Amino acid sequence: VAFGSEDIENTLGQLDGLAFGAIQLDGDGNILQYNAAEGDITGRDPKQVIGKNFFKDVAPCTDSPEFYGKFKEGVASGNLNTMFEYTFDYQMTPTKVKVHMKKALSGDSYWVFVKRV
Amino acid sequence: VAFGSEDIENTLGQLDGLAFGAIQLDGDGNILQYNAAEGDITGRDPKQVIGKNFFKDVAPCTDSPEFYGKFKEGVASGNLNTMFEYTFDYQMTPTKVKVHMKKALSGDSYWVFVKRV
Ligand SMILES: [Cl-]
Ligand SMILES: [Cl-]
Ligand SMILES: [Cl-]
Ligand SMILES: [Cl-]
Ligand SMILES: [Cl-]
Ligand SMILES: [Cl-]
Known part of the structure; x- marks a missing residue:
C-alpha cells in the first residue's frame, strides 16, 4: 500500500505492516x-x-x-481527503511530516496517515 | 515476527512490513x-x-x-546474537533504542534490529 494512494481506505497486526504511520480516529x-x-x-x-x-x-x-x-x-x-505538511512537537523533538487525512470506507472513522518529509 | 525472537534470521517489500527497524550488513x-x-x-x-x-x-x-x-x-x-541498549545521535536527535544484532542464516550477512526504548 503506497502513501497517498487513491484506494487506501478500501485496502485498509496488518496495520503494523504499513510502512508509514497510520492512526484511526472516530468523529x-x-x-x-x-x-x-x-x-x-x-x-x-x-x-x-x-x-x-x-x-x-x-x-x-x-x-x-x-x-x-x-x-x-x-x-x-x-x-475528507487531504494532504498537507505539518510539524509535530508536543513532548517530542520537532518533526516535519507529510499528512494524509481521509474518511474511512465505512464513514464512521477517519484515517490520519503520516510519513517523515 | 517479534523483536528478539529466537528464529528471526530464519524468517527473514516484506522487509518494510516489519514493525521495527531492520538493517542488513555485510561483514x-x-x-x-x-x-x-x-x-x-x-x-x-x-x-x-x-x-x-x-x-x-x-x-x-x-x-x-x-x-x-x-x-x-x-x-x-x-x-553473533546479542541484545543491548544504545543511543543514536549523529546528525539526528538523540534517540534511545534497543538493538539486537544477529548473524544471518547464510553466514554472509549480519542483521541489526532496532526499536525505541
Ligand atoms: Cl474544540
Ligand atoms: Cl504534536
Ligand atoms: Cl502521533
Ligand atoms: Cl576500524
Ligand atoms: Cl549515530
Ligand atoms: Cl540507522
Whole structure:
C-alpha cells in the first residue's frame, strides 16, 4: 500500500505492516488504532494513546485550523481527503511530516496517515 | 515476527512490513538493506544509506567497542546474537533504542534490529 494512494481506505497486526504511520480516529477525534510506524516516527507509545484524543491530548500542536479544523469540517460534511505538511512537537523533538487525512470506507472513522518529509 | 525472537534470521517489500527497524550488513559493515521503520526511528533516508558503512558513515556513534566492537568479534568468530541498549545521535536527535544484532542464516550477512526504548 503506497502513501497517498487513491484506494487506501478500501485496502485498509496488518496495520503494523504499513510502512508509514497510520492512526484511526472516530468523529470525535479519539484514537481507535495507532500503528507501530507512528510510534517509530514520534516516540509516542502506541499502547498508551488508544482512547485518547489525538487533537486535544496526544498531539496538541494539531489543534489548529490547519489540521483539527480540516478534520472537523470533514467529519461534519463527509468530505475528507487531504494532504498537507505539518510539524509535530508536543513532548517530542520537532518533526516535519507529510499528512494524509481521509474518511474511512465505512464513514464512521477517519484515517490520519503520516510519513517523515 | 517479534523483536528478539529466537528464529528471526530464519524468517527473514516484506522487509518494510516489519514493525521495527531492520538493517542488513555485510561483514565489512556496509549496508545492503535498510527498512522503512529504521528511517521512521532515526530520520535517515533508506535510499541514501544503502552501500554506506553503518559504523563509519551512517551511524558513527556506533563506532565504539560496545557496538562496532561486538560486530567485528561476531564477524570474525561466526558467533553473533546479542541484545543491548544504545543511543543514536549523529546528525539526528538523540534517540534511545534497543538493538539486537544477529548473524544471518547464510553466514554472509549480519542483521541489526532496532526499536525505541
Ligand atoms: Cl474544540
Ligand atoms: Cl504534536
Ligand atoms: Cl502521533
Ligand atoms: Cl549515530
Ligand atoms: Cl540507522
Ligand atoms: Cl576500524
